[PDB]
From Swiss-Prot:
Annotated region described as DNA repair polymerase domain (Pol), given as residue ranges: 3-255
Gene designation: ligD
The protein's name in its UniProt record: Multifunctional non-homologous end joining DNA repair protein LigD
Species the sequence originates in: Mycobacterium tuberculosis (strain ATCC 25618 / H37Rv)
Interval of the full protein contained in this chain: 7 to 289 of 759
Effect annotated for changing K229A: Wild-type filling on single nt gaps, impaired gap filling on more complicated templates (in Pol domain)
Deletion phenotype: Not essential for growth, 80% reduction in NHEJ (in strain Erdman).
Organism classification: Bacteria, Bacillati, Actinomycetota, Actinomycetes, Mycobacteriales
Length: 283
């Protein structure tokens, strides 16, 4: 289990001078809190080899050159088969940094080992996710109000919801599923939540993607519960002008109208103070 960090001094975020080495330091720093929420999941790497002012790609297939110690599993998609890495150790996060994989994206299900053969196949959804996107003119205050409304509807079912500022423009919400549920079943439940909210507050919420009608509304994207979709991992850096993070928040923080995205240094400071706000999500 060995990684050599090359171009450690290469700036990946020109705006802030943040380097590959800084990204390595960050991922080392968040390893203990981040690994639980990506354990057992295929990791998709969004890479910016020349930094955030240069092109990115969304890399799913594991390269032939990938180190032999990386855990991996295969997924049959509608075209064929893809081998993914599974990130489950500090060394794995060191590899992520070396790859300039600023963002780590995962589905809401984990691999499960076969009864007799120990072969890894996709298992049930372990959590629901909601991806909340602000339409034009929509401020953080409205995103937070809609997030509370999602939380309340799920609370009517005895489900708990954890808020995450995405690091980009919106909010992500996670709710742990106590009993096993298929990704199909998860997508149905999430869609019904979204639709219920849109019916209750059609001027403030939409459950459909079409952008012509998104202005003034929060689009509550329920579709990333699909087995074939991903959502950025909690604690992931973002490939944006600033090295912001998909940062777990408290509901009390969401009562602040000045609510904003957090930078990676802030997230480290918060972990030092409070540990993992998502500790109960994948326990
Ligand atoms: N195919 C593909 N999917 C992507 C790519 N980048 C992100 N995704 C996925 O597309 C969806 C939206 O991702 P993003 O655009 O990063 O949105 P976000 O993290 O919710 O950030 P904001 O909406 O800006 O707050 C998620 O399902 C991601 O896993 C990409 O380059 N290619
Ligand atoms: Mn979004």
């Amino acid at each position: 289990q060995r990684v050599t960090l090359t171009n450690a001094d290469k700036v990946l975020y020109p705006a802030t001078g943040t380097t590959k080495s800084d990204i390595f330091d960050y991922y080392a720093g968040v390893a203990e809190v981040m690994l639980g929420h990506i354990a057992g999941r295929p990791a998709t790497r969004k890479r910016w080899p020349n930094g955030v002012d240069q092109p990115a790609f969304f890399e799913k297939q594991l390269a032939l050159s990938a180190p032999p110690w990386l855990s991996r599993a295969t997924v049959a998609h509608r075209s064929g088969t893809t081998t993914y890495p599974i990130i489950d150790s500090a060394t794995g996060l060191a590899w992520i940094a070396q790859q300039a994989a600023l963002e780590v994206h995962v589905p809401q299900w984990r691999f499960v080992a076969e009864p007799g053969s120990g072969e890894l196949n996709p298992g049930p959804a372990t959590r629901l996710v909601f991806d909340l996107d602000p339409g034009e003119g929509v401020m953080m205050a409205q995103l937070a109000e809609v997030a509370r409304a999602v939380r309340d509807l799920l609370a009517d079912i005895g489900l708990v919801t954890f808020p995450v500022t995405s690091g980009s423009k919106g909010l992500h919400l996670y709710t742990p599923l106590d009993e096993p549920v298929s990704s199909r079943g998860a997508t149905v439940l999430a869609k019904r939540v979204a639709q219920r909210l849109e019916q209750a507050m059609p001027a403030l919420v939409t459950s459909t993607m079409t952008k012509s009608l998104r202005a003034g509304k929060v689009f509550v994207d329920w579709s990333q519960n699909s087995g074939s979709k991903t959502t950025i991992a909690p604690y992931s850096l973002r490939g944006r002008t600033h090295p912001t993070v998909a940062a777990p928040r408290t509901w009390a923080e969401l009562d602040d109208p000045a609510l904003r995205q957090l930078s990676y240094d802030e997230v480290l400071t918060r972990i030092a103070r409070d540990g993992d706000l998502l500790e109960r999500l994948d326990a």
